[PDB]
Structures are given as structure tokens and as C-alpha cells.
Design a binder for this molecule. Structure first.
Ligand SMILES: [Mn+2]
Length: 745
DNA sequence: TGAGGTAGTAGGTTGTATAGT
DNA sequence: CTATACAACCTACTACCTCAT
């Protein structure tokens, strides 16, 4: 076996309790309260005084050296009060920002290649390094020929306990930048339209996109009311337009939309948001090159953070505070407790299966009773490829033969499909306007000889005449007909290939068409613990003020999806009511009653995005029905990463291993080998319950292995994962009542 | 949209650790 | 009993990669 760790660095030495300088902030201008301007006063007195450390405790303010207080600042004025040695046992945050400050000050003087500053530092948690690492440990810049800049984005967040020892938690993630602007991209005549841009000067938040580019110069007064150079002289920003030459005044104005107004900002300020769309459409060699550097296995992340901490060195302002360069050998020393979860034994038609691929020889666990008649849309210039495709997937579904040749890997009749090729419904459709796609799906649902659509769509790329996917899924969800839709590229894989590169695709096709007609391929053989049903819940929030109400999902102790339940009344705000929880848990009790002739006695409630609020309702509802129950909060995206160790060597962790402290657990559920990155684990915390977190996490991981619409396991559990996929597809579900056919899959 | 994973970019909210009072 | 900030959380979108029983 092996051991697990978190990306953490011990501190050699200890912070001895330093002498600070208390300060005070009075709301001289309009901001009467001290809370709304304590951050801005912190940065202002940090900036006016040679970037010396300035700290904040809840209403007060601090420094670390005696700094002359000032009164000229218009929003607030600062006055010295006193100077004390702050006790380390009662101050964790402020010695945290001490150690964070001295990491920033020790790194600001580190230069690479002689002249070039290796790090960009604004005295915070975020430390951008201009220099990446490579796999061969070369501190090398990474630039394009065009002017794109990959960079690291290190993140210190040290904590220091009551005694004095400090633990430096790190996480390297990379960063995309470019030196060029909208200015330079106009000067080399690139069509800058439709780009996502970032205002480098004004720090407004909002997805700024380019509408047009006005032919008027940026030195001429506009509809804003003045010249734009006057606009930046009047924002205390005129040192940016002071550098402007004649040709900089020969730039022309680029208007921009922020979904609330249009601005008029000069192209020298703006800069395109380098997404992978932009790297792909503008220099694909750079994008394919840096994909090895973006995705980082834990060994290369440890090498990157080793370079970072060796560039900390030793801080002589904090009693020679050094940080170690290796991780902890065990997170027992940090607080966590590690282990690996044994994988669940899964079963289909005939018992235990060795892999999830073997089910096509074995056979599916449940099939919905009846025959399921196909029906196919396909593009009008893509006819023979589509007929070969549906021939392939229908031979794999019905006949058990893969491009004609029957094999031992696939058993026959695994879906009870009914597709007579000379008799059943095909419709062709020309790739055109949206109402053609709507009437095309309507035309396939006129002829009522279809029980499962298998449409063919153009590819997600090739942004000429658009994807037929979304209008088809909207229509086939409104009209209650499940539809597994295929790309033309996958159809051409089915037509053209003489290899298994259509077989793996075809496995996932048939698992999709099984789950969408209401059959479930695999279940667990035995779910550990004493449990009778699982109830996933989740909610959503699209943007500001938009909220998705809570759609549930109901399993059994095998993990087969009994039901999923949209509730009736929409919520108010983020917090769903008590009536929603009332009808959801009434209907899980009804549904488990209907499936099994009895009530659940143990209901494990996985959930995401719920607070510890409204636990009192859960106590109420399952005391009054005396059903003991658990609530396990499964957090989808945690920033913690987990490494592994075989005698000091860092690798990715295998799937199933966890780290656990009390009732918060992190667990890697997905197996990601090197050259594809590090696994991004699951944060799992028990809100209320009485089961140990070993069986709680075992139910979690066993529900990750039962993704019923692919062959490789979903990272999330199928409770929280399928609950969230129902919450995203909030329209495709009918309002308020149950279904079993996994449309989202 | 074969499928799932990583990762970027961007933008919101807010539960819980944490100071006084 | 109450007022924070802020590391975590969530959301949306792509691109890249590999699927071996
Ligand atoms: Mn699908």
C-alpha cells in the first residue's frame, strides 16, 4: 500500500510574537462606517509608505513597523493609537498575514535570467510567476510567437497555530496572459471583433465583449462628454496616457458591451481574455504545446511548488523562518486521516461483473418491459454514413454483432429494440434554420411508430450552420420521447472504422439508450452500512438573482434509480421552503413504498449547496415518522488536491482513496493517470447523522461507480451528480411529477 | 451532442472560522 | 446576542485527451 498527503509545507522555525503598531480609521468623508473602507485604507496606507505591511483586525488596523499616520486621504483618516506585542495564541489571522507578507517580500527580490523578475507580487495570497516550470525542471518562460503568455498562479495561504509553528499551504495553478492589447491587435490588422476582453485599467467585473470599433480617434472628445485622455487624467490614471506617442493618439476607439450599457474605452487599455477558445483560434500550436503544462500531475505540481518554496528561502525578519521543501509524509501529522476505499462489486443480469465493460457479455440489470422502436433524424447530405451508423448501433443493441461479426464480448438482445430497416422511420433534414429543426422533430413525432429517437447532429465545433442538438432535446423533452443524438463525426467513426474505435463509442451509445428508456445497467451488489434508500438533492443559481429549485433523486440500497422528483412550487431565493422538503420526502417515502412494499428505515441524504440551516425540519420530519437518517454534504469542487507517496515520490492518487478529519472528508473518485493531470477530489462532510464516515464515503464511492450512462465512472456520486444534472436541465423535466427515464444522460 | 475526466477563462454567493462586546 | 471578511463554494463556457476486456 501507499500513503496520502495534502499539498502542504511545514515551517522550519517558529514565529516569535512580534511588536506591532495599533492604528485606527475614522470615516472622514462619506463612508461613515469603518468596515466599508478598512480594506481600501489598508491598501492606501500600504501604498503610500513603500509597500510596508499593513494589517486589519475586525474594526482596527495594524502595521508591523512604526509608520507615520496621515490625514490627507479623502475617504478616511488614520491615526496612530498604540503599540503592543500581539499574543500569538490569541492571534492566528494577523500572524498569518505576517507570514504571507514576508513570503511576498522575500519573493519580490527574486529575479530569473538576470534581469527578469520571476514573480509578480501584489502582497496577497496570489503570486503569479512569470516563469513556468517544465517537466525537465527548467525555469523557462512560455510565450507564443503571437504574444500569449502562460504563467503560474501560485497561492500561499499559511496558517500559524497558537504555539508558533507555521504550516504553508500551497496550490499551483496556471494562468493565461498576453502582452498585446486591442491596440496592437489592431495595429497588426487582426479582426478583433467578437472577442472577450478584459479592461486592464478599470477593474470592473463583467463579461466585456467587443461590439464594433469606431473609426474616430481616441484623442477626440466623444459621446462620453470629453476626450478619453481627459477621462483618464480625471481618474488619477493619467500616467498611463502620459506615455502616449503620436501613433498612440492615432488609435481608434473600440466600444464594448458589458450587458448593462456600452462603454467607450481606448484600445490601448483593453486586452483579450485568453480562453482556450482564443488559444485554439489564434495559435493552435501554442495550445497543444501548453496542454502538457496546464494539466499537471501531482509530481509536477510538487516540482512546481518545490521551486516556489526554494525561492522563499529563509526569511530573516521572522526568526529565520524557513519552509520545508517536501510534503508531509502523512497527514496524520496535519490533522487528517487517510485510507483507501475498496471498490464496489457491481452486478447486471447475471451477478458480479469484473469490469464495467463486461456487461454487454453479461446483460443489463433491469430493462424496461416492452419493445423500444427506434426512429432516426440525420442530415440530408449524410445519408449513407447515417445508415451505416444506425445499422451499427442497432446490430449492437439487437443482434449483438459488431459490424456483422458476432463475438463473445457482446450478448444478443440486450435492449429489446424494434427497428425494421426497410419499414421503420427515417427522416432527413437539411442543416438550416431553427424552425426547420423544430418541424423536423415534430415530423418524427407525428408518425407514432417511434419509442426512441436516435438523431444525427453536426459536430459541436465547425461553427457554421448551427448545431441541431438543443432544439431537438427541447422538443424531445417536451414530447416525452427519449433521444440519443449522435454527432456526424461519431457517425463517420461508425461508418468508416475497421477497429474498436467505434466499439467504445458504441458501448457508451447503448448505455445511453438503456438509461434513457428507463433501464439501469448495473447496481452495487452490497452497499456498505445499514441503508435502505439514498436521496440526492441539489439546487442551482445561474447568475445574480436566478435560482434553480431543488430537484431530488431516489435510489435503493442497490443504487438503482427508483425515481427522480421535481417539486411543484418554485422557491424564493436560494433557500427552498419547507413545503418543498415536505413534498419531496413524502414522495420518496411513497416511491420506495411503491417499489418495495415497505418504508425506508435508513435514508442517507446526499446533498450539495445546502446549508446546515433547515436541519430542524429534517429532525422534525424523521422523528415524527421515526426513520433514522443521515445527511452527507457532498461538495462538488474543492480546491484541495491530494498527492501520494511511495518512499517520498509523488504520484497521482488512485481512485477511491480518501483523507478524513472528524466529519469532513476529501476523496479522489476518478482515476487519472499522469500526462492527463491530477485528480480533483470530492469534499464530503456530514451535516447530521450517526454512521461512520468510512461507510459514508463507501456509499459515496460506490455511487460514483454506478454511472448509468457511460463506461467510466462519474466523479460525483450518482445521487448528487444526477441531482445536479436534473437541476441543470430544469426545463426538460416536467413540472412537479416523477419520472424514471434518465433523459439527461 | 459517445462518454467521462482534467484544466483554463469568466462571474456570482455565503457558510463557517473568528475577532470583539 | 450581532457585524464582518474571505476561502470555499457554486455557476456557465470552451479546449484536449483517451476510451483496451
Ligand atoms: Mn448523452
Amino acid at each position: 500500500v501507499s500513503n496520502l498527503t495534502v499539498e502542504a509545507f511545514e515551517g522550519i522555525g517558529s514565529v516569535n510574537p512580534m511588536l506591532f503598531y495599533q492604528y485606527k480609521v475614522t470615516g472622514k468623508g462619506k463612508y461613515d462606517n469603518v468596515y466599508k473602507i478598512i480594506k481600501s485604507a489598508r491598501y492606501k496606507m500600504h501604498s503610500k509608505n513603500r509597500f510596508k505591511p499593513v494589517f486589519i483586525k475586525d474594526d482596527k488596523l495594524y502595521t508591523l513597523e512604526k509608520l507615520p499616520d496621515i490625514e490627507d486621504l479623502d475617504f478616511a483618516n488614520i491615526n496612530f493609537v498604540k503599540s503592543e506585542v500581539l499574543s500569538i495564541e490569541d492571534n492566528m489571522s494577523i500572524y498569518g498575514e505576517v507570514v504571507e507578507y514576508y513570503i511576498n517580500l522575500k519573493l519580490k527580490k527574486v529575479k530569473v535570467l538576470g534581469k527578469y523578475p520571476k514573480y509578480r507580487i501584489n502582497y496577497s495570497k496570489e503570486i503569479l510567476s512569470n516563469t513556468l516550470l517544465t517537466r525537465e525542471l527548467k525555469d523557462e518562460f512560455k510565450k507564443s510567437n503571437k504574444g500569449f503568455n502562460l504563467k503560474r498562479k501560485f497561492r500561499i495561504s499559511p496558517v500559524v497555530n497558537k504555539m508558533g509553528k507555521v504550516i504553508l499551504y500551497l496550490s499551483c495553478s496556471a494562468d493565461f496572459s498576453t502582452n498585446k492589447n486591442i491596440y496592437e491587435m489592431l495595429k497588426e490588422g487582426l479582426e478583433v471583433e467578437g472577442l472577450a476582453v478584459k479592461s486592464e485599467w478599470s477593474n470592473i467585473s463583467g463579461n466585456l465583449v467587443i461590439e464594433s470599433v469606431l473609426e474616430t480617434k481616441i484623442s477626440e472628445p466623444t459621446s462620453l462628454g470629453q476626450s478619453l485622455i481627459d477621462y483618464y487624467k480625471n481618474n488619477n490614471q493619467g500616467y498611463r496616457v502620459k506615455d502616449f506617442t503620436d501613433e498612440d493618439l492615432n488609435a481608434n476607439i473600440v466600444n464594448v458591451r458589458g450587458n448593462k450599457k456600452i462603454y467607450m474605452y481606448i484600445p490601448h487599455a483593453l486586452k483579450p481574455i485568453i480562453t482556450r477558445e482564443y488559444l485554439a483560434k489564434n495559435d493552435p500550436e501554442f495550445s497543444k504545446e501548453i496542454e502538457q503544462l496546464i494539466k499537471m500531475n501531482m509530481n509536477y505540481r510538487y516540482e512546481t511548488l518545490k521551486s516556489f518554496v526554494n525561492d522563499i528561502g529563509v526569511i530573516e525578519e521572522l526568526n529565520n523562518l524557513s519552509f520545508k521543501n517536501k510534503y508531509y509524509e502523512d497527514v496524520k501529522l496535519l490533522g487528517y486521516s487517510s485510507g483507501k476505499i475498496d471498490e464496489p462489486v457491481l452486478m447486471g443480469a447475471k451477478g458480479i461483473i469484473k469490469n464495467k465493460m463486461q456487461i454487454f457479455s453479461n446483460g443489463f440489470y433491469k430493462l424496461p418491459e416492452g419493445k423500444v422502436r427506434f426512429g432516426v433524424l440525420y442530415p440530408k447530405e449524410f445519408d449513407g454514413v447515417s445508415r451505416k451508423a444506425i445499422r451499427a448501433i442497432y446490430d449492437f443493441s439487437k443482434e449483438g454483432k459488431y459490424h456483422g461479426e458476432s463475438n463473445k464480448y457482446i450478448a444478443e438482445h440486450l435492449i429489446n429494440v424494434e427497428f425494421n430497416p426497410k419499414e421503420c422511420i427515417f427522416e432527413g433534414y437539411e442543416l438550416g434554420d431553427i424552425t426547420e429543426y423544430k418541424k423536423a422533430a415534430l415530423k418524427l413525432n407525428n408518425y407514432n411508430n417511434v419509442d426512441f429517437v436516435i438523431a444525427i447532429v453536426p459536430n459541436m465545433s465547425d461553427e457554421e450552420i448551427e448545431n441541431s442538438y438543443n432544439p431537438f432535446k427541447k422538443i424531445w423533452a417536451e414530447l416525452n420521447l427519449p433521444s440519443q443524438m449522435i454527432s456526424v463525426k461519431t457517425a463517420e467513426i461508425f461508418a468508416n472504422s475497421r477497429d474498436n474505435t467505434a466499439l467504445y463509442y458504441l458501448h457508451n451509445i447503448v448505455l445511453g439508450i438503456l438509461g434513457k428508456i428507463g433501464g439501469i445497467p448495473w447496481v452495487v451488489k452490497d452497499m456498505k452500512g445499514d441503508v435502505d434508500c439514498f436521496v440526492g438533492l441539489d439546487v442551482g443559481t445561474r447568475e445574480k438573482g436566478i435560482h434553480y429549485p431543488a430537484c431530488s433523486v431516489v435510489f435503493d440500497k442497490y443504487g438503482k434509480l427508483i425515481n427522480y422528483y421535481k417539486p411543484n412550487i418554485p422557491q424564493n431565493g436560494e433557500k427552498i421552503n419547507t413545503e418543498i422538503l415536505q413534498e419531496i420526502f413524502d414522495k420518496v417515502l411513497i416511491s420506495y413504498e411503491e417499489e418495495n412494499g415497505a418504508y425506508p428505515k435508513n435514508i442517507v441524504i446526499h446533498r450539495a449547496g445546502f446549508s446546515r440551516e433547515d436541519l430542524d425540519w429534517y429532525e422534525n420530519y424523521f422523528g415524527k415518522k421515526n426513520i433514522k437518517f443521515n445527511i452527507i454534504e457532498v461538495k462538488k469542487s474543492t480546491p484541495l488536491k491530494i498527492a501520494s507517496i511511495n518512499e517520498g515520490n509523488i504520484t497521482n492518487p488512485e481512485k477511491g482513496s480518501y483523507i478524513l478529519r472528524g466529519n469532513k472528508a476529501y476523496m479522489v473518485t476518478t482515476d487519472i493517470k499522469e500526462n492527463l493531470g491530477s485528480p480533483k477530489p470530492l469534499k464530503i462532510e456530514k451535516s447530521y447523522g450517526d454512521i461512520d464516515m468510512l461507510t459514508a464515503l463507501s456509499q459515496i464511492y460506490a455511487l460514483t461507480q454506478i454511472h448509468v450512462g457511460a463506461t467510466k465512472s462519474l466523479r460525483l456520486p450518482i445521487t448528487t451528480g444526477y441531482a445536479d444534472k436534473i437541476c441543470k436541465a430544469i426545463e426538460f423535466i416536467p413540472q412537479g411529477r416523477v419520472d424514471n427515464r434518465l433523459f439527461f444522460l
